[PDB]
Nucleic acid binder design. Sequence first.
RNA 1: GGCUAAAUACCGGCACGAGACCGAUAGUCAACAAGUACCGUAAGGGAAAGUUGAAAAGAACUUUGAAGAGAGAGUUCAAGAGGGCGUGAAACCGUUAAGAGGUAAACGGGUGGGGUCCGCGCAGUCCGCCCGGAGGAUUCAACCCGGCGGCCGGUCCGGCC
RNA 2: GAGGUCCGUAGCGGUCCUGACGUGCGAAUCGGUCGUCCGACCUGGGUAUAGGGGCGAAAGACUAAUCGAACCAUCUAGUA
RNA 3: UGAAGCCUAGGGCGCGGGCCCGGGUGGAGCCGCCGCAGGUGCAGAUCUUGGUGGUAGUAGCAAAUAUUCAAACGAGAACUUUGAAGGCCGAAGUGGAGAAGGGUUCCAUGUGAACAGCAGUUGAACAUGGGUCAGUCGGUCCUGAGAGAUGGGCGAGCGCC
RNA 4: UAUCCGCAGCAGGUCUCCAAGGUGAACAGCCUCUGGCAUGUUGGAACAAUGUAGGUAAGGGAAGUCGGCAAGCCGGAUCCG
RNA 5: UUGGAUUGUUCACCCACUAAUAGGGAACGUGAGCUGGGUUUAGACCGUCGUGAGACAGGUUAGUUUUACCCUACUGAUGAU
RNA 6: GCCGGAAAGGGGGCCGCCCUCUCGCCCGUCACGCACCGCACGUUCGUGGGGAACCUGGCGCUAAACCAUUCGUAGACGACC
Length: 153
Amino acid sequence: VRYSLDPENPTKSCKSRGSNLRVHFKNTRETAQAIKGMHIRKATKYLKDVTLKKQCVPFRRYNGGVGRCAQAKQWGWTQGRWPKKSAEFLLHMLKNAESNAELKGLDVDSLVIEHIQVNKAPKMRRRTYRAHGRINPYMSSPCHIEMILTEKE
RNA sequence: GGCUAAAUACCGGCACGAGACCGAUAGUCAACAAGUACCGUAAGGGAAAGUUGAAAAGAACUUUGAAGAGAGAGUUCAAGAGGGCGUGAAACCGUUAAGAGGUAAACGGGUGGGGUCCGCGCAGUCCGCCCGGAGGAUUCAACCCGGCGGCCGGUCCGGCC
RNA sequence: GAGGUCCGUAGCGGUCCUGACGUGCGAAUCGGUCGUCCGACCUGGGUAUAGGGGCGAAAGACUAAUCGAACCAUCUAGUA
RNA sequence: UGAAGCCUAGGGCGCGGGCCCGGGUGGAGCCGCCGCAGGUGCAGAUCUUGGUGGUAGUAGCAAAUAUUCAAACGAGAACUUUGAAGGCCGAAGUGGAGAAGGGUUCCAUGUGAACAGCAGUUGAACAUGGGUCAGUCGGUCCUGAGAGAUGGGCGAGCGCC
RNA sequence: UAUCCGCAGCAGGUCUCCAAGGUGAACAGCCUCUGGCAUGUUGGAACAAUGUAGGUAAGGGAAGUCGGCAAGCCGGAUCCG
RNA sequence: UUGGAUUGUUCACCCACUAAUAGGGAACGUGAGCUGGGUUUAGACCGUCGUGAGACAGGUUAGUUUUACCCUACUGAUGAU
RNA sequence: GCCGGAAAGGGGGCCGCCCUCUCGCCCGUCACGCACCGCACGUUCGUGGGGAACCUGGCGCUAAACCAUUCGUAGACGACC
Ligand SMILES: [Mg+2]
Ligand SMILES: [Mg+2]
Ligand SMILES: [Mg+2]
Ligand SMILES: [Mg+2]
Ligand SMILES: [Mg+2]
Ligand SMILES: [Mg+2]
Ligand SMILES: [Mg+2]
Ligand SMILES: [Mg+2]
Ligand SMILES: [Mg+2]
Ligand SMILES: [Mg+2]
Ligand SMILES: [Mg+2]
Ligand SMILES: [Mg+2]
Ligand SMILES: [Mg+2]
Ligand SMILES: [Mg+2]
Ligand SMILES: [Mg+2]
Ligand SMILES: [Mg+2]
Ligand SMILES: [Mg+2]
Ligand SMILES: [Mg+2]
Ligand SMILES: [Mg+2]
Ligand SMILES: [Mg+2]
Ligand SMILES: [Mg+2]
Ligand SMILES: [Mg+2]
Ligand SMILES: [Mg+2]
Ligand SMILES: [Mg+2]
Ligand SMILES: [Mg+2]
Ligand SMILES: [Mg+2]
Ligand SMILES: [Mg+2]
Ligand SMILES: [Mg+2]
Ligand SMILES: [Mg+2]
Ligand SMILES: [Mg+2]
Ligand SMILES: [Mg+2]
Ligand SMILES: [Mg+2]
Ligand SMILES: [Mg+2]
Ligand SMILES: [Mg+2]
Ligand SMILES: [Mg+2]
Ligand SMILES: [Mg+2]
Ligand SMILES: [Mg+2]
Ligand SMILES: [Mg+2]
Ligand SMILES: [Mg+2]
Ligand SMILES: [Mg+2]
Ligand SMILES: [Mg+2]
Ligand SMILES: [Mg+2]
Ligand SMILES: [Mg+2]
Ligand SMILES: [Mg+2]
Ligand SMILES: [Mg+2]
Ligand SMILES: [Mg+2]
Ligand SMILES: [Mg+2]
Ligand SMILES: [Mg+2]
Ligand SMILES: [Mg+2]
Ligand SMILES: [Mg+2]
Ligand SMILES: [Mg+2]
Ligand SMILES: [Mg+2]
C-alpha cells in the first residue's frame, strides 16, 4: 500500500507485504537482517537450511540470554539460533514475492532482496495467574513484514 | 367550638423558551443496546464506549497461497479516507542516509571542520543640482475670460448666538 | 466379653523436620513423620442467637479471606 | 486559487515570556486592535486517567512411574482416530450411579478468526439443528425443632409482644 | 486432578450407595481381572556446578550441635522370661 | 597458635596435647550465606509491686528468618582491535 | 665486481666500464626573461600516507579457514584433542 522506501526503478522491482502475523517480532527481525542482501535462490536455500538447523541466524540486537553455537563463526558472531516459524513465514512471503515478479514479467533468477523491514503490530492480550491471587498480562508480539526485490546482475 | 380566596413556596412531574455555561479524561454516573455490562450472600457498588465518504460508489476481474494475507486492476477529488475507516502529536520501534565512538551519557564558553538549505550572489548602489552633445513636443513667462479657495474692510452692509 | 481401655485402618486433626514452596499448585498448599480412632465421637440438611450485640471446655477466640467492637450508605469535601 | 491543527538540517525578530515568514500534510473555519469576563499558563504532589519502554525473547512452561510402531483422513500429525505392543488406576478406584450446586455444558453436523499458557484435522470453543413423556419415582399431604396471623395488650408511629 | 466454590481446565474444598482374585489377622501395603486412562497447561538433545527427593560408605561411634535436630537401631508370629 | 567438659554466650574455668597454645581490625567483618540457643510482639506459670487494669536490666517454657533474571565486583567460557 | 651491517641488520666507501665537459666553483665582460603596473596563504620534505579504479608490458602462482561429519585425552553451550 504505502511502502517505507520506494524502489529506485518501479519496473525492475517487485513488492510483497504481510500484516498481523503471529510470529515473534524479535526473531523475525533478525531473520530478515540475515537475509537482507541475498539473491533469491541463495536466500531460499539458506532459509531451508535454517529450518533444518543446518545454518544459524545470528542474534545481534536481541541477543540477551541467547546461547552460543559453532555456526555463527561464519557470520563473525557468537550467538545464533534457528527460528523455524520465523523462517517459514517469510519463506511463504518470498514465494509470494517471486510469484508477483513473475506476474509482472520479470527475470526470477536475477532477483536480489533490496529492501526488507519488520515492524511491530498491535498486541493481543491473554492472562496468566500468579501467586497470591494476582493477574498479569500474557501479551503477544505480532509483526508486519515488508519486502522489495529487484533485478541486478 | 368551627369555616375561609389573594398576595407566598416548588432541585419531583407534563410541556415549553433561553444562556458572556461544558464541548467526549469536560458536561449528569449515563451524547452510544446506561443505572447497561460487570463484582458482592445481601444492603448496595457500577464502568469503558462519538466522527469513512457528498453519495457505498464498501474494491468486480486476473494472479500466488489451505487461509489469513499480498501483487496488479478499479471507485472516489482524496484509499496519503479500505468497515474501531476525519485530522494523526509525544514516549517507544523498523529501515534509509550522514557523522562519530577505550574514561556512561548529556551540558556551558570559544573556535574549527563537514553537511542541508538560503542569498535566486557571481563583475555590483543610487538620488538631487549643474556643464557639454545629440534628440523629441503645441511649450515657458507675460496678458485675457470663467470657476473655486484663503485672508482682510482702521469703523462696508446684513444676520445669528 | 466390661472399659470416656491399648496397637492400628477409614474418618477427624495438625507435632517435628523450624523439610518443600515462598512474584507458589495455593491470599495457608505439599511430602515424610505424627495425635486420636465406641465416644466429652465425626458429619449433611433444617432451625435459633446480630454488632457495644451474639456465641465462646476462655486463645480477646469466631461472627462470609474483615474483629481489643463486622459490613453498607449517609451526616461528610468531618477536624488537623 | 485552501482556515484551524500537526511536522520541519529552511529565513528571521525579541534580554525573555514568545512571535512572524518559507516548505510539507491537512480539508472549513480563523485572526489583529479598543474595552469586558474568567473553571486562564505545570516537572514534580508514593498526583488522576490512558499509553509505551529497559528488564527480556529473560524467569519460567519439573507434585502423582511411560511410552513405541504402522495405517487412515488431512495442505499440513510428538499430540486426532483405528490396530498392535508395553504400562498405570487396582473394587476405601483414575470404575458404575445420585444429593447440593451449575443451566444446555447433553447429542449430531460443520468451522478452524479468537480461546483451550506448545500444537491441533481435536474441544465443556464458535455456528447450525435436535433432545427431558409417569395414577403406582419425587413434590404436592403430615408434623418436628421453630416460624406466624386474628382476639388482647403495648406503642408518637411504621408497628411490636 | 476439566461441567460445583476458590478471578482459572487452580496439587485446596465439597454429602452418600455398589465393591472381584492372590498374599496376608485384615476394607493395611504389593501384583492381577471387569471397567477406565494416557502421565496431568508442551516436546527434543545432553548428564557441568548449585539444588529437590532418594541410597550406600572403610576405621571410630555424638568427639558434631544450644540441644542425638536429622537419619539410623527395633519391628510380625510361636516358645520361654 | 589445637582437640574437648560446663555455659546462648562474648568472657570465664578446667582436662589433654603442644613448639606455642600471642593480642587485635575489617559498619562491635560476615542473616537476599546459614542457625535461631539469648534478647526482641502476640499464649501461659512463679516471686515481688499495685485496690485494680497491669509492671519488673527477676526466673521459666512455646513461638512464620521473604525476593536475584538487573548493574558492578569475582570465578570460569567464547570472542574482539 | 670488492667489501661496510643483527639490540629494532648498512641506498655507504672502493676497483674496473663503452661514453661524454671543459659545462658545474670564485672573480670579471655581455645582454636576455611575462618589467603582469605597492598588497595574503609564496618557497619544500613529496613520485608523502591511504582508497578506488583506467593501463601497457615482463616474471611468475594456482591456497586455505570455517560450517557439516567423525573422535572423547575435552565438555553446561561455545571452546578443545
Ligand atoms: Mg543487547
Ligand atoms: Mg544475564
Ligand atoms: Mg501460575
Ligand atoms: Mg485464588
Ligand atoms: Mg368564641
Ligand atoms: Mg376563634
Ligand atoms: Mg428573553
Ligand atoms: Mg472521551
Ligand atoms: Mg463522561
Ligand atoms: Mg476518546
Ligand atoms: Mg478529543
Ligand atoms: Mg478522551
Ligand atoms: Mg476517531
Ligand atoms: Mg485528504
Ligand atoms: Mg483523510
Ligand atoms: Mg486515520
Ligand atoms: Mg527514524
Ligand atoms: Mg551508519
Ligand atoms: Mg480408646
Ligand atoms: Mg489409642
Ligand atoms: Mg502449630
Ligand atoms: Mg519451613
Ligand atoms: Mg525459591
Ligand atoms: Mg440483647
Ligand atoms: Mg468448643
Ligand atoms: Mg470502638
Ligand atoms: Mg467535511
Ligand atoms: Mg469558562
Ligand atoms: Mg496541561
Ligand atoms: Mg506532565
Ligand atoms: Mg527460548
Ligand atoms: Mg529459559
Ligand atoms: Mg504440574
Ligand atoms: Mg465415580
Ligand atoms: Mg458415568
Ligand atoms: Mg460433546
Ligand atoms: Mg495455544
Ligand atoms: Mg409476631
Ligand atoms: Mg513423568
Ligand atoms: Mg503427555
Ligand atoms: Mg488437569
Ligand atoms: Mg561408617
Ligand atoms: Mg563398619
Ligand atoms: Mg558435646
Ligand atoms: Mg564443640
Ligand atoms: Mg527424630
Ligand atoms: Mg557485626
Ligand atoms: Mg550480607
Ligand atoms: Mg535473612
Ligand atoms: Mg527462641
Ligand atoms: Mg511472651
Ligand atoms: Mg537461565
